[PDB]
Write a protein that binds this ligand. Structure first.
Ligand SMILES: *CC(=O)c1ccc(OC)c2c1OCC2=O
Ligand SMILES: [Cl-]
Ligand SMILES: [Cl-]
Ligand SMILES: [Cl-]
Lengths: 68, 64
């Protein structure tokens, strides 16, 4: 009946709108969490190289200190 | 009565507010984590820079 169809139009309109918003939110959370994982990697390696350079320079300083 | 309808309206409004603020707790947790990982990444980037500066200098100090 036109009244019933009315009720159903509004039900399956609000519901499909919710189904749009749900996806737009979850893809967002996903991106953010992938970027957190990506930075926590690009930091493990950056600190590897940083502390490696630290050891190398504390060695080269000693070479110079030995030849004077 | 239809004031049950106004009550369901103004109730489920403020209840959807629940997951909106939960999503905000989660997304802003992530956003602050990320900001700070960026501050730290930047520190390391410039520290690598300065370290390599002084390393190449010491190397051209040994030979020269
Ligand atoms: C937060 C909210 O109103 C909402 C809307 C639609 C959903 O179904 C996919 C769900 C929520 O919160 C939890 C959830 O499953
Ligand atoms: Cl509505
Ligand atoms: Cl927001
Ligand atoms: Cl914010």
């Amino acid at each position: 009946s036109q009244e019933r169809i009315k009720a159903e139009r509004k039900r399956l309109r609000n519901r499909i709108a919710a189904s749009k918003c749900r996806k737009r939110k979850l893809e967002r959370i996903s991106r953010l969490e992938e970027k957190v994982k990506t930075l926590k990697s690009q930091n493990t390696e950056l600190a590897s190289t940083a502390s490696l350079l630290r050891e190398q320079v504390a060695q080269l300083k000693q070479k110079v200190l030995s030849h004077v | 009565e239809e004031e049950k309808r106004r009550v369901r309206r103004e109730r489920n409004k403020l209840a959807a507010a629940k997951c909106r603020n939960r999503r905000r707790e989660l997304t802003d947790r992530l956003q602050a984590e990320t900001d700070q990982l960026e501050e730290e990444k930047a520190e390391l980037e410039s520290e690598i820079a300065e370290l390599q500066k002084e390393k190449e200098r010491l190397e051209f100090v040994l030979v020269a």
